[PDB]
Amino acid sequence: VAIRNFDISKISGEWYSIFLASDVKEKIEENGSMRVFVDVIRALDNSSLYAEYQTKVNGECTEFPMVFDKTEEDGVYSLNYDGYNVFRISEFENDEHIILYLVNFDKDRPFQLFEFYAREPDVSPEIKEEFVKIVQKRGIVKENIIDLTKIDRCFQLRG
Amino acid sequence: VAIRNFDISKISGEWYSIFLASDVKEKIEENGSMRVFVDVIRALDNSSLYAEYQTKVNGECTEFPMVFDKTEEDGVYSLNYDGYNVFRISEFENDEHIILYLVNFDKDRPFQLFEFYAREPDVSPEIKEEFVKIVQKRGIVKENIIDLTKIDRCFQLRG
């Protein structure tokens, strides 16, 4: 229930991607642009955030960096990747879990996307349930929630 | 069908609010923060946009300005009003109609909102139909679409 602002001095280091949820399924499905799995986040110099992601293109595991630029609103960041994106990072229940709400402002097909990150590769079933509920309040349906701990997240490449 | 980038040199002057649509109805209902009716838009100096809005608080017509700040993405603007908002302005079918897609990044209750502006106070039924369809693709339901030409938009104050 407890969704608060993340303290950015606590964010750096290794994370895992737990769920992806979106009202445009194709973005988080096999070969979608947002089917990506976090590895590490680092705080850069001007308040920008750096992250490395694994992803599978055509069945092979790859990796690439992203950078997130701080907006004037706290906990809110913009990101140039498959167009322009704005999202908020929040702490979910405690500082070991991050809930992420993003929108991509594509002219023709914008969409909303949730990411859920944890310091552990898998989470308790209670956390999962609270996550689905939250996404369902945003109006996304359960079919569109993809549980990532049940697939290949390219762990061979982490580090 | 034709949804393109608005040419900002064509934007200034008088507009009218035609519809409001949102997945959080209360924002566009009587006394909601987003139940607002455009009057005029002006282009400012640094690419910022200025607009004046009428609104009814507790049954009396009022007015106040808003300013929209240009992001790096074209057609996309941020706005500090009832928290932090990001939206895209597009031309709808022709330069006399603007379709507006906004998100408010409130931590606890974010929402999506569409505004529809025209150079005329009312529009053809074809335009209306295309508008509802577009909103329904975004996953908002018809009950949440409020047709503004059927209420009081405080015209006494325009000018």
PDB file of C-alpha atoms in Angstrom:
ATOM      1  CA  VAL A   1       0.000   0.000   0.000  1.00  0.00           C
ATOM      2  CA  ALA A   2       2.910   2.221   0.983  1.00  0.00           C
ATOM      3  CA  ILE A   3       4.048   3.971  -2.220  1.00  0.00           C
ATOM      4  CA  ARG A   4       6.426   6.814  -1.515  1.00  0.00           C
ATOM      5  CA  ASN A   5       9.228   8.746  -3.136  1.00  0.00           C
ATOM      6  CA  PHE A   6      12.374   6.752  -3.613  1.00  0.00           C
ATOM      7  CA  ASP A   7      15.459   8.145  -1.939  1.00  0.00           C
ATOM      8  CA  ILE A   8      17.907   8.456  -4.816  1.00  0.00           C
ATOM      9  CA  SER A   9      20.972   8.047  -2.574  1.00  0.00           C
ATOM     10  CA  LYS A  10      19.733   4.495  -2.016  1.00  0.00           C
ATOM     11  CA  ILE A  11      19.107   3.553  -5.664  1.00  0.00           C
ATOM     12  CA  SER A  12      22.469   2.549  -7.021  1.00  0.00           C
ATOM     13  CA  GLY A  13      23.645  -0.978  -7.510  1.00  0.00           C
ATOM     14  CA  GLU A  14      22.049  -4.133  -8.836  1.00  0.00           C
ATOM     15  CA  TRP A  15      18.380  -4.658  -9.428  1.00  0.00           C
ATOM     16  CA  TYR A  16      16.148  -7.240 -11.081  1.00  0.00           C
ATOM     17  CA  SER A  17      13.111  -6.852 -13.288  1.00  0.00           C
ATOM     18  CA  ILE A  18      10.071  -8.636 -11.807  1.00  0.00           C
ATOM     19  CA  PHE A  19       7.053  -7.504 -13.893  1.00  0.00           C
ATOM     20  CA  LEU A  20       6.139  -5.571 -16.978  1.00  0.00           C
ATOM     21  CA  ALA A  21       2.560  -4.294 -17.543  1.00  0.00           C
ATOM     22  CA  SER A  22       1.215  -2.178 -20.380  1.00  0.00           C
ATOM     23  CA  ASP A  23      -1.980  -1.207 -22.174  1.00  0.00           C
ATOM     24  CA  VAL A  24      -0.152  -1.939 -25.417  1.00  0.00           C
ATOM     25  CA  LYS A  25       0.955  -5.541 -24.915  1.00  0.00           C
ATOM     26  CA  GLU A  26       3.133  -5.661 -27.985  1.00  0.00           C
ATOM     27  CA  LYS A  27       5.596  -3.274 -26.356  1.00  0.00           C
ATOM     28  CA  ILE A  28       6.341  -5.818 -23.626  1.00  0.00           C
ATOM     29  CA  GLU A  29       6.147  -9.036 -25.658  1.00  0.00           C
ATOM     30  CA  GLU A  30       8.866 -10.940 -27.450  1.00  0.00           C
ATOM     31  CA  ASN A  31      10.890  -8.403 -29.410  1.00  0.00           C
ATOM     32  CA  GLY A  32       8.853  -5.440 -28.045  1.00  0.00           C
ATOM     33  CA  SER A  33      11.014  -2.323 -27.348  1.00  0.00           C
ATOM     34  CA  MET A  34      10.136  -2.388 -23.598  1.00  0.00           C
ATOM     35  CA  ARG A  35      10.811  -6.056 -22.872  1.00  0.00           C
ATOM     36  CA  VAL A  36      13.999  -5.151 -21.064  1.00  0.00           C
ATOM     37  CA  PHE A  37      15.513  -6.358 -17.809  1.00  0.00           C
ATOM     38  CA  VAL A  38      17.408  -4.041 -15.501  1.00  0.00           C
ATOM     39  CA  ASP A  39      20.864  -4.922 -14.245  1.00  0.00           C
ATOM     40  CA  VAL A  40      22.484  -1.942 -12.635  1.00  0.00           C
ATOM     41  CA  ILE A  41      21.609   1.609 -11.857  1.00  0.00           C
ATOM     42  CA  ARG A  42      24.175   4.317 -11.087  1.00  0.00           C
ATOM     43  CA  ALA A  43      23.645   7.916 -10.054  1.00  0.00           C
ATOM     44  CA  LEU A  44      25.557  10.261 -12.419  1.00  0.00           C
ATOM     45  CA  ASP A  45      26.858  13.746 -11.875  1.00  0.00           C
ATOM     46  CA  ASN A  46      24.027  16.180 -12.721  1.00  0.00           C
ATOM     47  CA  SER A  47      21.239  14.214 -11.062  1.00  0.00           C
ATOM     48  CA  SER A  48      20.913  11.990 -14.192  1.00  0.00           C
ATOM     49  CA  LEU A  49      20.582   8.248 -13.678  1.00  0.00           C
ATOM     50  CA  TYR A  50      22.385   5.572 -15.636  1.00  0.00           C
ATOM     51  CA  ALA A  51      21.170   1.986 -16.059  1.00  0.00           C
ATOM     52  CA  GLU A  52      22.159  -1.081 -17.942  1.00  0.00           C
ATOM     53  CA  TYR A  53      19.577  -3.436 -19.421  1.00  0.00           C
ATOM     54  CA  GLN A  54      19.655  -6.884 -20.890  1.00  0.00           C
ATOM     55  CA  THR A  55      17.200  -7.752 -23.626  1.00  0.00           C
ATOM     56  CA  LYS A  56      16.719 -10.576 -26.162  1.00  0.00           C
ATOM     57  CA  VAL A  57      16.593  -9.676 -29.806  1.00  0.00           C
ATOM     58  CA  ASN A  58      15.579 -12.640 -31.975  1.00  0.00           C
ATOM     59  CA  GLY A  59      16.468 -15.073 -29.209  1.00  0.00           C
ATOM     60  CA  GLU A  60      19.988 -13.864 -28.294  1.00  0.00           C
ATOM     61  CA  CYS A  61      20.760 -11.951 -25.084  1.00  0.00           C
ATOM     62  CA  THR A  62      22.143  -8.437 -25.497  1.00  0.00           C
ATOM     63  CA  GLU A  63      22.715  -5.358 -23.333  1.00  0.00           C
ATOM     64  CA  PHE A  64      22.637  -1.579 -23.625  1.00  0.00           C
ATOM     65  CA  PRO A  65      22.626   1.498 -21.424  1.00  0.00           C
ATOM     66  CA  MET A  66      19.846   4.034 -20.936  1.00  0.00           C
ATOM     67  CA  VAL A  67      20.065   7.403 -19.230  1.00  0.00           C
ATOM     68  CA  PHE A  68      17.326   9.045 -17.274  1.00  0.00           C
ATOM     69  CA  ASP A  69      17.193  12.882 -17.044  1.00  0.00           C
ATOM     70  CA  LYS A  70      15.683  14.552 -13.953  1.00  0.00           C
ATOM     71  CA  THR A  71      12.708  16.826 -14.652  1.00  0.00           C
ATOM     72  CA  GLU A  72      11.805  19.605 -12.218  1.00  0.00           C
ATOM     73  CA  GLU A  73       9.326  17.253 -10.457  1.00  0.00           C
ATOM     74  CA  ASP A  74      10.977  14.952  -7.905  1.00  0.00           C
ATOM     75  CA  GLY A  75      10.893  11.203  -8.576  1.00  0.00           C
ATOM     76  CA  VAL A  76      10.105  12.104 -12.230  1.00  0.00           C
ATOM     77  CA  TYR A  77      12.406  11.539 -15.162  1.00  0.00           C
ATOM     78  CA  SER A  78      12.351  11.725 -18.975  1.00  0.00           C
ATOM     79  CA  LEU A  79      14.025   9.187 -21.286  1.00  0.00           C
ATOM     80  CA  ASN A  80      14.671   9.273 -25.027  1.00  0.00           C
ATOM     81  CA  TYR A  81      14.231   5.636 -26.123  1.00  0.00           C
ATOM     82  CA  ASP A  82      11.682   4.457 -28.734  1.00  0.00           C
ATOM     83  CA  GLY A  83      10.490   8.070 -28.686  1.00  0.00           C
ATOM     84  CA  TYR A  84       9.994  10.355 -25.652  1.00  0.00           C
ATOM     85  CA  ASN A  85       9.045   8.904 -22.263  1.00  0.00           C
ATOM     86  CA  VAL A  86       8.268  10.393 -18.826  1.00  0.00           C
ATOM     87  CA  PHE A  87       7.996   8.243 -15.737  1.00  0.00           C
ATOM     88  CA  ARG A  88       8.023   8.353 -11.972  1.00  0.00           C
ATOM     89  CA  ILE A  89      10.080   5.992  -9.817  1.00  0.00           C
ATOM     90  CA  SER A  90       8.526   5.188  -6.456  1.00  0.00           C
ATOM     91  CA  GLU A  91       9.561   2.995  -3.550  1.00  0.00           C
ATOM     92  CA  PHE A  92       7.076   0.132  -3.127  1.00  0.00           C
ATOM     93  CA  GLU A  93       6.468  -0.781   0.483  1.00  0.00           C
ATOM     94  CA  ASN A  94      10.206  -0.480   1.292  1.00  0.00           C
ATOM     95  CA  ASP A  95      13.465   0.636  -0.349  1.00  0.00           C
ATOM     96  CA  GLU A  96      14.169  -2.827  -1.776  1.00  0.00           C
ATOM     97  CA  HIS A  97      11.318  -2.552  -4.263  1.00  0.00           C
ATOM     98  CA  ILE A  98      10.726   0.076  -6.963  1.00  0.00           C
ATOM     99  CA  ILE A  99       7.469   0.619  -8.817  1.00  0.00           C
ATOM    100  CA  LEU A 100       7.836   2.529 -12.072  1.00  0.00           C
ATOM    101  CA  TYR A 101       5.042   4.267 -13.999  1.00  0.00           C
ATOM    102  CA  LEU A 102       5.956   5.479 -17.489  1.00  0.00           C
ATOM    103  CA  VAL A 103       4.197   6.970 -20.469  1.00  0.00           C
ATOM    104  CA  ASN A 104       5.562   7.157 -24.004  1.00  0.00           C
ATOM    105  CA  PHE A 105       4.225  10.194 -25.836  1.00  0.00           C
ATOM    106  CA  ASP A 106       4.202   8.652 -29.274  1.00  0.00           C
ATOM    107  CA  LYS A 107       1.849  10.720 -31.401  1.00  0.00           C
ATOM    108  CA  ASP A 108      -0.009   7.792 -32.944  1.00  0.00           C
ATOM    109  CA  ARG A 109       0.173   5.165 -30.221  1.00  0.00           C
ATOM    110  CA  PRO A 110       1.088   6.396 -26.740  1.00  0.00           C
ATOM    111  CA  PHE A 111       0.979   3.897 -23.941  1.00  0.00           C
ATOM    112  CA  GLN A 112       1.406   3.445 -20.257  1.00  0.00           C
ATOM    113  CA  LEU A 113       3.864   0.912 -18.815  1.00  0.00           C
ATOM    114  CA  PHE A 114       4.673  -0.312 -15.327  1.00  0.00           C
ATOM    115  CA  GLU A 115       8.029  -1.874 -14.360  1.00  0.00           C
ATOM    116  CA  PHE A 116       8.640  -3.435 -10.993  1.00  0.00           C
ATOM    117  CA  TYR A 117      12.203  -3.831  -9.692  1.00  0.00           C
ATOM    118  CA  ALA A 118      13.510  -5.623  -6.670  1.00  0.00           C
ATOM    119  CA  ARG A 119      16.905  -6.209  -5.027  1.00  0.00           C
ATOM    120  CA  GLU A 120      16.019  -9.965  -5.206  1.00  0.00           C
ATOM    121  CA  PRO A 121      15.280 -11.947  -8.407  1.00  0.00           C
ATOM    122  CA  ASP A 122      11.897 -13.046  -7.215  1.00  0.00           C
ATOM    123  CA  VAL A 123       9.460 -11.615  -4.651  1.00  0.00           C
ATOM    124  CA  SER A 124       6.829 -12.772  -2.186  1.00  0.00           C
ATOM    125  CA  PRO A 125       3.333 -13.565  -3.473  1.00  0.00           C
ATOM    126  CA  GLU A 126       1.879 -10.784  -1.277  1.00  0.00           C
ATOM    127  CA  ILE A 127       4.004  -8.188  -3.098  1.00  0.00           C
ATOM    128  CA  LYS A 128       2.915  -9.678  -6.388  1.00  0.00           C
ATOM    129  CA  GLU A 129      -0.788  -9.379  -5.468  1.00  0.00           C
ATOM    130  CA  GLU A 130      -0.450  -5.735  -4.379  1.00  0.00           C
ATOM    131  CA  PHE A 131       1.320  -5.064  -7.673  1.00  0.00           C
ATOM    132  CA  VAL A 132      -1.443  -6.495  -9.873  1.00  0.00           C
ATOM    133  CA  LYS A 133      -4.123  -4.587  -7.957  1.00  0.00           C
ATOM    134  CA  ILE A 134      -2.276  -1.302  -8.421  1.00  0.00           C
ATOM    135  CA  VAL A 135      -1.924  -1.944 -12.123  1.00  0.00           C
ATOM    136  CA  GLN A 136      -5.596  -2.861 -12.349  1.00  0.00           C
ATOM    137  CA  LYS A 137      -6.601   0.434 -10.696  1.00  0.00           C
ATOM    138  CA  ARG A 138      -4.684   2.192 -13.509  1.00  0.00           C
ATOM    139  CA  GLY A 139      -7.031   0.383 -15.892  1.00  0.00           C
ATOM    140  CA  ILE A 140      -4.629  -2.120 -17.336  1.00  0.00           C
ATOM    141  CA  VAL A 141      -5.937  -5.680 -17.567  1.00  0.00           C
ATOM    142  CA  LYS A 142      -4.340  -8.762 -15.958  1.00  0.00           C
ATOM    143  CA  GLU A 143      -3.718 -10.434 -19.337  1.00  0.00           C
ATOM    144  CA  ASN A 144      -1.309  -7.560 -19.978  1.00  0.00           C
ATOM    145  CA  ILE A 145       0.783  -8.199 -16.830  1.00  0.00           C
ATOM    146  CA  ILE A 146       3.839 -10.352 -17.684  1.00  0.00           C
ATOM    147  CA  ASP A 147       5.542 -12.152 -14.820  1.00  0.00           C
ATOM    148  CA  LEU A 148       9.239 -11.959 -15.659  1.00  0.00           C
ATOM    149  CA  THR A 149      10.562 -14.408 -13.080  1.00  0.00           C
ATOM    150  CA  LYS A 150       9.160 -17.209 -15.313  1.00  0.00           C
ATOM    151  CA  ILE A 151      11.198 -16.385 -18.323  1.00  0.00           C
ATOM    152  CA  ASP A 152      14.802 -15.947 -19.333  1.00  0.00           C
ATOM    153  CA  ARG A 153      16.182 -12.622 -18.156  1.00  0.00           C
ATOM    154  CA  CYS A 154      19.663 -13.155 -19.587  1.00  0.00           C
ATOM    155  CA  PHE A 155      21.331 -13.572 -16.194  1.00  0.00           C
ATOM    156  CA  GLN A 156      24.469 -14.917 -17.941  1.00  0.00           C
ATOM    157  CA  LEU A 157      25.241 -11.348 -18.899  1.00  0.00           C
ATOM    158  CA  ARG A 158      24.783  -9.630 -15.495  1.00  0.00           C
ATOM    159  CA  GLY A 159      27.953  -7.991 -14.167  1.00  0.00           C
TER     160      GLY A 159
ATOM    161  CA  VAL B   1      -7.866  10.029 -38.832  1.00  0.00           C
ATOM    162  CA  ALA B   2      -5.221  12.602 -39.702  1.00  0.00           C
ATOM    163  CA  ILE B   3      -3.400  13.406 -36.439  1.00  0.00           C
ATOM    164  CA  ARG B   4      -0.225  15.357 -37.031  1.00  0.00           C
ATOM    165  CA  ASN B   5       2.057  17.812 -35.306  1.00  0.00           C
ATOM    166  CA  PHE B   6       0.533  21.206 -34.796  1.00  0.00           C
ATOM    167  CA  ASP B   7       2.399  24.088 -36.369  1.00  0.00           C
ATOM    168  CA  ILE B   8       2.997  26.405 -33.430  1.00  0.00           C
ATOM    169  CA  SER B   9       3.092  29.542 -35.607  1.00  0.00           C
ATOM    170  CA  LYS B  10      -0.588  28.848 -36.266  1.00  0.00           C
ATOM    171  CA  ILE B  11      -1.697  28.292 -32.653  1.00  0.00           C
ATOM    172  CA  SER B  12      -2.231  31.737 -31.238  1.00  0.00           C
ATOM    173  CA  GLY B  13      -5.560  33.406 -30.793  1.00  0.00           C
ATOM    174  CA  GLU B  14      -8.944  32.263 -29.569  1.00  0.00           C
ATOM    175  CA  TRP B  15     -10.012  28.699 -29.074  1.00  0.00           C
ATOM    176  CA  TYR B  16     -12.929  26.836 -27.525  1.00  0.00           C
ATOM    177  CA  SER B  17     -13.040  23.731 -25.383  1.00  0.00           C
ATOM    178  CA  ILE B  18     -15.213  21.015 -26.970  1.00  0.00           C
ATOM    179  CA  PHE B  19     -14.583  17.823 -24.932  1.00  0.00           C
ATOM    180  CA  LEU B  20     -12.876  16.574 -21.831  1.00  0.00           C
ATOM    181  CA  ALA B  21     -12.149  12.836 -21.324  1.00  0.00           C
ATOM    182  CA  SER B  22     -10.318  11.139 -18.477  1.00  0.00           C
ATOM    183  CA  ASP B  23      -9.865   7.800 -16.739  1.00  0.00           C
ATOM    184  CA  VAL B  24     -10.398   9.651 -13.469  1.00  0.00           C
ATOM    185  CA  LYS B  25     -13.788  11.282 -14.018  1.00  0.00           C
ATOM    186  CA  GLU B  26     -13.660  13.392 -10.901  1.00  0.00           C
ATOM    187  CA  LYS B  27     -10.902  15.512 -12.423  1.00  0.00           C
ATOM    188  CA  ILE B  28     -13.246  16.676 -15.187  1.00  0.00           C
ATOM    189  CA  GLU B  29     -16.505  16.914 -13.225  1.00  0.00           C
ATOM    190  CA  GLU B  30     -18.033  19.845 -11.409  1.00  0.00           C
ATOM    191  CA  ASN B  31     -15.274  21.437  -9.351  1.00  0.00           C
ATOM    192  CA  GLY B  32     -12.609  19.016 -10.703  1.00  0.00           C
ATOM    193  CA  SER B  33      -9.195  20.711 -11.287  1.00  0.00           C
ATOM    194  CA  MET B  34      -9.300  19.928 -15.057  1.00  0.00           C
ATOM    195  CA  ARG B  35     -12.812  21.147 -15.840  1.00  0.00           C
ATOM    196  CA  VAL B  36     -11.410  24.204 -17.555  1.00  0.00           C
ATOM    197  CA  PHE B  37     -12.307  25.943 -20.798  1.00  0.00           C
ATOM    198  CA  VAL B  38      -9.685  27.525 -23.014  1.00  0.00           C
ATOM    199  CA  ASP B  39     -10.023  31.097 -24.206  1.00  0.00           C
ATOM    200  CA  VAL B  40      -6.802  32.296 -25.717  1.00  0.00           C
ATOM    201  CA  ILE B  41      -3.399  30.926 -26.443  1.00  0.00           C
ATOM    202  CA  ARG B  42      -0.329  33.084 -27.099  1.00  0.00           C
ATOM    203  CA  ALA B  43       3.178  32.054 -28.072  1.00  0.00           C
ATOM    204  CA  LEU B  44       5.720  33.554 -25.616  1.00  0.00           C
ATOM    205  CA  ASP B  45       9.370  34.342 -26.059  1.00  0.00           C
ATOM    206  CA  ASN B  46      11.344  31.168 -25.230  1.00  0.00           C
ATOM    207  CA  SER B  47       9.032  28.733 -26.993  1.00  0.00           C
ATOM    208  CA  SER B  48       6.712  28.672 -23.917  1.00  0.00           C
ATOM    209  CA  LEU B  49       2.974  28.903 -24.514  1.00  0.00           C
ATOM    210  CA  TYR B  50       0.546  31.038 -22.568  1.00  0.00           C
ATOM    211  CA  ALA B  51      -3.189  30.353 -22.246  1.00  0.00           C
ATOM    212  CA  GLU B  52      -6.122  31.742 -20.403  1.00  0.00           C
ATOM    213  CA  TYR B  53      -8.862  29.503 -19.033  1.00  0.00           C
ATOM    214  CA  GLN B  54     -12.295  30.054 -17.631  1.00  0.00           C
ATOM    215  CA  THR B  55     -13.575  27.698 -14.972  1.00  0.00           C
ATOM    216  CA  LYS B  56     -16.498  27.585 -12.506  1.00  0.00           C
ATOM    217  CA  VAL B  57     -15.711  27.256  -8.848  1.00  0.00           C
ATOM    218  CA  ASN B  58     -18.841  26.642  -6.764  1.00  0.00           C
ATOM    219  CA  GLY B  59     -21.053  27.934  -9.556  1.00  0.00           C
ATOM    220  CA  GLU B  60     -19.323  31.256 -10.364  1.00  0.00           C
ATOM    221  CA  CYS B  61     -17.243  31.805 -13.516  1.00  0.00           C
ATOM    222  CA  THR B  62     -13.575  32.650 -13.001  1.00  0.00           C
ATOM    223  CA  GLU B  63     -10.396  32.809 -15.088  1.00  0.00           C
ATOM    224  CA  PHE B  64      -6.677  32.172 -14.722  1.00  0.00           C
ATOM    225  CA  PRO B  65      -3.584  31.756 -16.860  1.00  0.00           C
ATOM    226  CA  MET B  66      -1.470  28.646 -17.362  1.00  0.00           C
ATOM    227  CA  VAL B  67       1.934  28.403 -18.994  1.00  0.00           C
ATOM    228  CA  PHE B  68       3.204  25.493 -20.980  1.00  0.00           C
ATOM    229  CA  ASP B  69       6.985  24.805 -21.135  1.00  0.00           C
ATOM    230  CA  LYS B  70       8.489  23.130 -24.226  1.00  0.00           C
ATOM    231  CA  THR B  71      10.288  19.840 -23.551  1.00  0.00           C
ATOM    232  CA  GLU B  72      12.961  18.590 -25.949  1.00  0.00           C
ATOM    233  CA  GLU B  73      10.314  16.517 -27.814  1.00  0.00           C
ATOM    234  CA  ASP B  74       8.339  18.539 -30.373  1.00  0.00           C
ATOM    235  CA  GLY B  75       4.603  18.991 -29.781  1.00  0.00           C
ATOM    236  CA  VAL B  76       5.294  18.006 -26.128  1.00  0.00           C
ATOM    237  CA  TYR B  77       5.002  20.305 -23.155  1.00  0.00           C
ATOM    238  CA  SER B  78       5.089  20.146 -19.341  1.00  0.00           C
ATOM    239  CA  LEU B  79       2.770  22.127 -17.044  1.00  0.00           C
ATOM    240  CA  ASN B  80       2.861  22.678 -13.288  1.00  0.00           C
ATOM    241  CA  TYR B  81      -0.826  22.753 -12.275  1.00  0.00           C
ATOM    242  CA  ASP B  82      -2.424  20.352  -9.749  1.00  0.00           C
ATOM    243  CA  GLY B  83       0.976  18.646  -9.753  1.00  0.00           C
ATOM    244  CA  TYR B  84       3.235  17.881 -12.751  1.00  0.00           C
ATOM    245  CA  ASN B  85       1.740  17.223 -16.189  1.00  0.00           C
ATOM    246  CA  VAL B  86       3.180  16.306 -19.613  1.00  0.00           C
ATOM    247  CA  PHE B  87       1.086  16.414 -22.750  1.00  0.00           C
ATOM    248  CA  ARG B  88       1.287  16.501 -26.510  1.00  0.00           C
ATOM    249  CA  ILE B  89      -0.698  18.924 -28.664  1.00  0.00           C
ATOM    250  CA  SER B  90      -1.642  17.572 -32.076  1.00  0.00           C
ATOM    251  CA  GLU B  91      -3.592  18.975 -35.000  1.00  0.00           C
ATOM    252  CA  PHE B  92      -6.776  16.945 -35.539  1.00  0.00           C
ATOM    253  CA  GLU B  93      -7.683  16.550 -39.179  1.00  0.00           C
ATOM    254  CA  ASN B  94      -6.821  20.220 -39.895  1.00  0.00           C
ATOM    255  CA  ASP B  95      -5.281  23.246 -38.156  1.00  0.00           C
ATOM    256  CA  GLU B  96      -8.637  24.420 -36.783  1.00  0.00           C
ATOM    257  CA  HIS B  97      -8.838  21.510 -34.358  1.00  0.00           C
ATOM    258  CA  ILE B  98      -6.388  20.486 -31.620  1.00  0.00           C
ATOM    259  CA  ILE B  99      -6.370  17.148 -29.833  1.00  0.00           C
ATOM    260  CA  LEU B 100      -4.503  17.166 -26.532  1.00  0.00           C
ATOM    261  CA  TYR B 101      -3.236  14.109 -24.636  1.00  0.00           C
ATOM    262  CA  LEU B 102      -1.986  14.766 -21.102  1.00  0.00           C
ATOM    263  CA  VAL B 103      -0.837  12.748 -18.134  1.00  0.00           C
ATOM    264  CA  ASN B 104      -0.536  13.999 -14.565  1.00  0.00           C
ATOM    265  CA  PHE B 105       2.230  12.195 -12.705  1.00  0.00           C
ATOM    266  CA  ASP B 106       0.622  12.329  -9.300  1.00  0.00           C
ATOM    267  CA  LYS B 107       2.273   9.657  -7.187  1.00  0.00           C
ATOM    268  CA  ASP B 108      -0.929   8.216  -5.747  1.00  0.00           C
ATOM    269  CA  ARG B 109      -3.437   8.836  -8.518  1.00  0.00           C
ATOM    270  CA  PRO B 110      -2.005   9.630 -11.951  1.00  0.00           C
ATOM    271  CA  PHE B 111      -4.427   9.945 -14.801  1.00  0.00           C
ATOM    272  CA  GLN B 112      -4.726  10.507 -18.482  1.00  0.00           C
ATOM    273  CA  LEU B 113      -6.839  13.338 -19.917  1.00  0.00           C
ATOM    274  CA  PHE B 114      -7.850  14.388 -23.410  1.00  0.00           C
ATOM    275  CA  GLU B 115      -8.883  17.954 -24.329  1.00  0.00           C
ATOM    276  CA  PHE B 116     -10.259  18.856 -27.712  1.00  0.00           C
ATOM    277  CA  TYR B 117     -10.101  22.463 -28.937  1.00  0.00           C
ATOM    278  CA  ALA B 118     -11.612  24.079 -31.963  1.00  0.00           C
ATOM    279  CA  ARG B 119     -11.658  27.555 -33.538  1.00  0.00           C
ATOM    280  CA  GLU B 120     -15.507  27.226 -33.455  1.00  0.00           C
ATOM    281  CA  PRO B 121     -17.649  26.720 -30.313  1.00  0.00           C
ATOM    282  CA  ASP B 122     -19.202  23.559 -31.606  1.00  0.00           C
ATOM    283  CA  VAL B 123     -18.082  20.991 -34.196  1.00  0.00           C
ATOM    284  CA  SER B 124     -19.553  18.607 -36.745  1.00  0.00           C
ATOM    285  CA  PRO B 125     -20.877  15.240 -35.556  1.00  0.00           C
ATOM    286  CA  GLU B 126     -18.287  13.440 -37.729  1.00  0.00           C
ATOM    287  CA  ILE B 127     -15.452  15.125 -35.807  1.00  0.00           C
ATOM    288  CA  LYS B 128     -17.162  14.200 -32.574  1.00  0.00           C
ATOM    289  CA  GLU B 129     -17.384  10.512 -33.574  1.00  0.00           C
ATOM    290  CA  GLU B 130     -13.705  10.335 -34.581  1.00  0.00           C
ATOM    291  CA  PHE B 131     -12.861  11.921 -31.234  1.00  0.00           C
ATOM    292  CA  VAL B 132     -14.730   9.353 -29.128  1.00  0.00           C
ATOM    293  CA  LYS B 133     -13.190   6.463 -31.067  1.00  0.00           C
ATOM    294  CA  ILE B 134      -9.682   7.799 -30.495  1.00  0.00           C
ATOM    295  CA  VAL B 135     -10.352   8.166 -26.799  1.00  0.00           C
ATOM    296  CA  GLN B 136     -11.799   4.664 -26.677  1.00  0.00           C
ATOM    297  CA  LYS B 137      -8.649   3.222 -28.286  1.00  0.00           C
ATOM    298  CA  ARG B 138      -6.696   4.803 -25.395  1.00  0.00           C
ATOM    299  CA  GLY B 139      -8.883   2.699 -23.104  1.00  0.00           C
ATOM    300  CA  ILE B 140     -11.042   5.411 -21.655  1.00  0.00           C
ATOM    301  CA  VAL B 141     -14.759   4.634 -21.527  1.00  0.00           C
ATOM    302  CA  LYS B 142     -17.536   6.697 -23.159  1.00  0.00           C
ATOM    303  CA  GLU B 143     -19.179   7.489 -19.801  1.00  0.00           C
ATOM    304  CA  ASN B 144     -16.000   9.438 -19.047  1.00  0.00           C
ATOM    305  CA  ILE B 145     -16.253  11.665 -22.157  1.00  0.00           C
ATOM    306  CA  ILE B 146     -17.957  14.985 -21.276  1.00  0.00           C
ATOM    307  CA  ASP B 147     -19.422  16.990 -24.135  1.00  0.00           C
ATOM    308  CA  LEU B 148     -18.711  20.601 -23.206  1.00  0.00           C
ATOM    309  CA  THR B 149     -20.881  22.320 -25.802  1.00  0.00           C
ATOM    310  CA  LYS B 150     -23.908  21.298 -23.659  1.00  0.00           C
ATOM    311  CA  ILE B 151     -22.865  23.133 -20.586  1.00  0.00           C
ATOM    312  CA  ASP B 152     -21.930  26.613 -19.484  1.00  0.00           C
ATOM    313  CA  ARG B 153     -18.413  27.515 -20.561  1.00  0.00           C
ATOM    314  CA  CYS B 154     -18.465  31.007 -19.061  1.00  0.00           C
ATOM    315  CA  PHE B 155     -18.555  32.786 -22.421  1.00  0.00           C
ATOM    316  CA  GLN B 156     -19.469  36.051 -20.629  1.00  0.00           C
ATOM    317  CA  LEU B 157     -15.848  36.272 -19.581  1.00  0.00           C
ATOM    318  CA  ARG B 158     -14.136  35.637 -22.960  1.00  0.00           C
ATOM    319  CA  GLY B 159     -12.023  38.559 -24.180  1.00  0.00           C
TER     320      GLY B 159
END
